[PDB]
Amino acid sequence: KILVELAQQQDREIGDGTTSVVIIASELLKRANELVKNKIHPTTIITGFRVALREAIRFINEVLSTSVDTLGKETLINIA
Amino acid sequence: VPSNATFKNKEKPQEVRKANIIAARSVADAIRTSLGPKGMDKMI
């Protein structure tokens, strides 16, 4: 029911991405199933995902592109 | 030395107290894994 409520959640904030949020959240748990067999405690697994996330959000803000682009808009048509 | 003083009767309370301790320690074993910062959550 967590991913069921997570898919219903994604519509509330952004409104789009219900397909990508479920696959990513299911893959984070899938690969973590082999990490617990290593005896690694989840707090180490959670910290490894959070420290990598803090650097991931900052990396996305560095690679973003401005909406100016060329003279004309040429954006909102491609956004839809 | 034996055969004198008194002899213990109705020993069931001795077993009842053991059954209560074993049943109580079994509950304390599930919550034991949640102790400390390394503890885990329990979903019910």
Curated annotation (Swiss-Prot), chain A:
It is found in: Cytoplasm. It comes from the Eukaryota. Molecular chaperone; assists the folding of proteins upon ATP hydrolysis. Known to play a role, in vitro, in the folding of actin and tubulin. In yeast may play a role in mitotic spindle formation. Heterooligomeric complex of about 850 to 900 kDa that forms two stacked rings, 12 to 16 nm in diameter. Belongs to the TCP-1 chaperonin family. This is T-complex protein 1 subunit alpha. The gene is TCP1. The chain holds residues 81 to 160 of 559 of the full protein.
Curated annotation (Swiss-Prot), chain B:
It comes from Saccharomyces cerevisiae (strain ATCC 204508 / S288c). Coiled coil: none annotated. Molecular chaperone; assists the folding of proteins upon ATP hydrolysis. Known to play a role, in vitro, in the folding of actin and tubulin. In yeast may play a role in mitotic spindle formation. Present with 5530 molecules/cell in log phase SD medium. Belongs to the TCP-1 chaperonin family. It is found in: Cytoplasm. This is T-complex protein 1 subunit delta. Heterooligomeric complex of about 850 to 900 kDa that forms two stacked rings, 12 to 16 nm in diameter.
